[PDB]
Write a protein that binds this ligand. Structure first.
Ligand SMILES: [Mg+2]
Ligand SMILES: [Mg+2]
Ligand SMILES: [Mg+2]
Ligand SMILES: [Mg+2]
Ligand SMILES: [Mg+2]
Ligand SMILES: [Mg+2]
Ligand SMILES: [Mg+2]
Ligand SMILES: [Mg+2]
Lengths: 103, 146, 49
RNA sequence: UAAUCUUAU
RNA sequence: AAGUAAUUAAUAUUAGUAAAACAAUAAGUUAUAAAUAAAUAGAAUAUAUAUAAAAAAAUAUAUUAAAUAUUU
RNA sequence: AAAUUUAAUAUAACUAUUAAUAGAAGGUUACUAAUAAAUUAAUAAUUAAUUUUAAAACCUAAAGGUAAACCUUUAUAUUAAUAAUGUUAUGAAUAAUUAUUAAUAAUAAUAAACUAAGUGAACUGAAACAUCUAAGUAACUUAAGGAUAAGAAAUCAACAGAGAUAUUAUGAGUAUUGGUGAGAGAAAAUAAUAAAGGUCUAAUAAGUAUUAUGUGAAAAAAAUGUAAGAAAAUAGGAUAACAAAUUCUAAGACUAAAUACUAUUAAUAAGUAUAGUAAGUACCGUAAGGGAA
């Protein structure tokens, strides 16, 4: 099991190292200095109400998610839902076709 | 915007000292400016230009006849009050810079703004001014004995 | 002589220090094991498919 | 006229 | 002391393989279907058929394909 | 059993490629400008490696000068403290010289190519020429480094997706574009080359985005002078325009490797003896400069 984990891609491993699944990261935006703060979401600083750019630039986050999907480990990541990025099958399912296609 | 003619300047990295063949006689009064002095539009080094430089472009006619021209920023010499220094400081000032100063409330504020952009768009003179102001502020705050 | 720190800068530094003071969420061995197990399960599922 | 600018000490 | 080299293109000759060829990591290039500006159109002696203009569909003009068998 | 030949090798050639490794004194004339060890390994002398150590005149923009190799300062310096010494005026005081100790400054000879930035021709081509071209090339100027630049998407794409840069094959001389002339000419995508390639150092960014206007890599913007000038992720950017939908988060940052140029070593030469070491000398010119045998 440990061996299996080790085998996983490098990026994913790195991510796990600093954001483990032991903690449940908030779905919605939060204080930037809370310890349940999602890396993928633009959190806000308490002193000076300034939205900090996500701790994971969107692309990187997407990549990570993809990697997780590839090895089944989606649930052990924090939730993406509040970033508007969906992936693969779910996206296909839930997509409202464009105004131009429908009429 | 971009600070291409500031953040591209490079200065000989100092070797730190735990002697050199030629050491200077005086003592470095001011902290080294990251980006150094500009060797490009040296008129700018005297004052506060906000990272604006001379542009060079083409005068173009009705016959599309290109002919080189330059563009200067609107520099104005202007004595402005510094609460911390307790005196008016006169310098060269791009009118844009003046406007910015007005917006921000005082020359000290302008100098002492934290962002890297601000640092970039100060000159060496600007940097010096900033140093003066912040040092002064520190002194005001913190006498030798508490 | 190094340029003195600005108020905002000082505040930032303080904040950083405060952040440092707290315990860093280190990766749990149990968590790792769980992850591994999950991976294994996924692999098995794939094989079955 | 404590806009700006010119000269002298 | 003076028709050379590089990167391409078209023709020819000979060789290799050949309805495929080169490369074979995946691509890609040319050939295998003609035509039209382009579009959702496209092949059984020719007098049949394909595409273009035309049109209900033919004709008419151009080019193409199509003849106990073994594809170009 | 010694000689002869053949091929290879030097401190003793340069040139091209490939591979590895690394990123460094000239002159002038003389009071000529030198060395000394130790330790470790190999076998007391030994060679090598690793080290510490003496000397080293003058000149080569910036001790300060000058007509380069000279002159002028005066570290056989000045100040202080003392010690022996001679003189003067009254054991104490003042000046002079020598000798010890302490204090107080000393010397920009430094490459070349490569990289980035500023300015930026013209000949030429168009069979004339002015738009265009040559060309952001030559050249001049400035600044850094062993490399520099770039770099972890306010990117591409198309409703399926990818996932930093760098530059090579293809894509493709295709799309795009041009006094629609001369001509110029992408990107996605797939491959190689490559390295662990991701990672926080911002309390997350306005006179900033944007607009107007003047400029601006022949095709694709990102830049920029002058004034107007936003918004909080319930928000911005991305396409003539709008509506949908996608995607990314500017105004804060760090970054090995592939690459360029030099120098050395090794190898390979249907390379050079007029591209085979002399000499940047003779000589030519006031000079920059040219330049033999
Ligand atoms: Mg004289
Ligand atoms: Mg240049
Ligand atoms: Mg760099
Ligand atoms: Mg950088
Ligand atoms: Mg060009
Ligand atoms: Mg932001
Ligand atoms: Mg960013
Ligand atoms: Mg003569």
């Amino acid at each position: 099991y440990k061996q299996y984990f080790d085998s996983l891609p490098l990026k994913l491993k790195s991510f796990f190292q600093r954001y483990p699944p032991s903690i449940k990261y908030s779905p919605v935006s939060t204080s930037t200095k809370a310890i349940n703060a999602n890396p993928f979401l633009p959190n806000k600083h308490p002193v000076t109400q300034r939205f900090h750019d996500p701790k994971y630039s969107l692309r990187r986050m997407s990549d990570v998610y993809k990697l997780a999907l590839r090895y089944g480990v989606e649930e052990f990541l924090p939730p993406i839902e509040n970033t508007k990025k969906l992936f693969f099958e779910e996206k296909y399912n839930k997509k409202t076709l464009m105004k131009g296609v429908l009429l | 915007r971009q600070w291409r003619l500031i953040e591209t300047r490079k200065i000989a990295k100092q070797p730190n000292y735990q002697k050199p063949l030629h050491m200077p006689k005086e003592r470095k009064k001011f902290p080294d400016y990251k980006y150094g002095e500009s060797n490009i539009f040296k008129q700018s080094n005297k004052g506060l230009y906000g990272g604006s430089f001379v542009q060079f472009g083409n005068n173009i006619s009705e016959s599309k006849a290109k002919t080189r021209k330059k563009w200067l920023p609107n520099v104005v010499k202007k004595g402005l009050w510094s609460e911390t220094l307790n005196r008016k400081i006169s310098i060269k000032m791009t009118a844009k810079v003046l406007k910015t100063i007005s917006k921000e409330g005082g020359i000290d504020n302008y100098l002492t703004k934290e962002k890297s952009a601000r640092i970039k768009e100060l000159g060496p003179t600007g940097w010096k001014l900033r140093y003066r102001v912040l040092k002064r502020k520190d002194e005001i705050e913190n006498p030798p004995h508490k | 002589p190094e340029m003195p720190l600005t108020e905002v800068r000082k505040s930032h530094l303080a904040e950083k220090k405060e952040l440092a003071e707290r315990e860093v969420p280190k990766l749990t061995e149990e968590d790792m094991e769980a992850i591994g197990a999950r991976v294994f399960e996924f692999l098995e599922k794939q094989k079955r498919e």
